[PDB]
């Protein structure tokens, strides 16, 4: 039974690479983080920064989340991210993703003690 903070780490952290360098990055990572078990997760973002740097965003700019909650934070600096989105020809169990690498600010929702990211809201 996964904690919220651990689920965020599993779904969104990839510190082992600086950037996606291949069109198959999302296919490989969505499978290896178990995001294609039972269903293809339609959209998921991976962040290529240290866990510490992502946790620090919870002390940066406080903004609204898309759902109206006020525990979201926008990173002051841009970060290396990869957006993974299912293509039109994706169909479980053969999930297929488009990989889009970018450098953008991240917006995360933070909760708990320690106060850490639990939800990825958006990138800008
Ligand atoms: Cl897992
Ligand atoms: Cl996401
Ligand atoms: Cl402010
Ligand atoms: Na948690």
Swiss-Prot record:
Question: Its GO CC terms?
Answer: extracellular region
Q: Please give the residues the UniProt entry marks as glycosylated.
A: 1, 7, 34, 37, 41
- The main location is secreted
* Tissues expressing this chain: Pancreas.
Q: Which residues form a coiled coil?
A: none
Give the family from UniProt: Belongs to the pancreatic ribonuclease family.
This chain's protein is named Ribonuclease pancreatic
- Organism, by scientific name, is Bos taurus
Gene name, please? RNASE1
């Amino acid at each position: 039974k996964e904690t919220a903070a651990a689920k965020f780490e599993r779904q969104h952290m990839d510190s082992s690479t600086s950037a996606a360098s291949s069109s198959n990055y999302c296919n490989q990572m969505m499978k290896s983080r178990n995001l294609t078990k039972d269903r293809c997760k339609p959209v998921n973002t991976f962040v290529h920064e240290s866990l510490a740097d992502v946790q620090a965003v919870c002390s940066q700019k406080n903004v609204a989340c898309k759902n109206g909650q006020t525990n979201c934070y926008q990173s002051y600096s841009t970060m290396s991210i990869t957006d993974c989105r299912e293509t039109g020809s994706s169909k479980y169990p053969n999930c297929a993703y488009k990989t889009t690498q970018a450098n953008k600010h991240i917006i995360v929702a933070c909760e708990g003690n320690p106060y850490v990211p639990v939800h990825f809201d958006a990138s800008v």
